[PDB]
Ligand binder design. Structure first.
Ligand SMILES: Cc1c(O)cccc1C(=O)Nc1cccc2ccc(C(=N)N)cc12
Length: 238
């Protein structure tokens, strides 16, 4: 996260840090708890990932330092990538992680509600992006979860900033005309939370952007509401 500040512990209870153990353990992506056995994250986070066995999901984390060899985690039973996903910039950058065990909810770890189709008209004015990603272009994974309040921009406005891309209605952008605050590498899979009517909604999933926090270069996110049917279908037992 660029231009953000340190989060208060437990302030974003749905935020998880997804680690890979190969070659050695490290933070791979952010993710959001949306069900007792489900994490919603970005598809491009699993590039080169041949098996869910090298993945570890850590919930209720503020500082990466809390994570040690003796720290408990949730194993991943299955990685579900949208069948139309090819790459972040083309859309469909969404994936579900089915955990091997269930998450016991508490003040430090709870699910974030998904947006409703009837809210596609709502005008979220209190949106925040969070993660342990880069604080700059040439940076590295941060210890403390960062947060930044960022205003959403219309898709038409976003399209103007990315003339070489197709900003579809399945994408949503957020950023300041002058830049300064934005998600960055490492924040991928992270949630773009917006508080509406005293309730937090998972509006977007950190997906991509040209650089980080540059002027006239809004961050691009997966428009979650456009995938509620997909999520319902993929999360139903088999
Ligand atoms: C290519 C690259 C790096 O190597 C290091 C840091 C940033 C970048 C980059 O251009 N874009 C990016 C690469 C991977 C994940 C990203 C997540 C969010 C954003 C965003 N601005 N909302 C940009 C990203």
């Amino acid at each position: 996260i660029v231009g953000g500040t340190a989060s208060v512990r437990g302030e974003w209870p749905w935020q998880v840090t997804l680690h890979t153990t190969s070659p050695t353990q490290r933070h791979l992506c952010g993710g959001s708890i949306i069900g007792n056995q489900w994490i919603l994250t970005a598809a491009h986070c699993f590039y080169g990932v041949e098996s869910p066995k090298i993945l570890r999901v850590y919930s209720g984390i503020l500082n990466q330092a809390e994570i040690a060899e003796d720290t408990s985690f949730f194993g991943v039973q299955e990685i579900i990538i949208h069948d139309q996903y090819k790459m972040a910039e083309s859309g469909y950058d969404i994936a579900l992680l089915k955990l091997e065990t269930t998450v016991n909810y508490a003040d430090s770890q709870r699910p974030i509600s998904l947006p409703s189709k009837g809210d596609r008209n709502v005008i979220y004015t209190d949106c925040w992006v969070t993660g342990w990603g880069y604080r700059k272009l040439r940076d590295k994974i941060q210890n403390t979860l960062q947060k930044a309040k960022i205003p959403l921009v219309t898709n038409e406005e976003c399209q103007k900033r990315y003339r070489g891309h197709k900003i579809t209605h399945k994408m949503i952008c957020a950023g300041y005309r002058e830049g300064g605050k934005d998600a960055c590498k490492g924040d991928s899979g992270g949630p773009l939370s917006c508080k509406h009517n005293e309730v937090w909604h998972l509006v977007g999933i950190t997906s991509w952007g040209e650089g980080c926090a540059q002027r006239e270069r809004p961050g691009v996110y997966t428009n979650v509401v456009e995938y509620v049917d997909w999520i319902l279908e993929k999360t139903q037992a088999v």
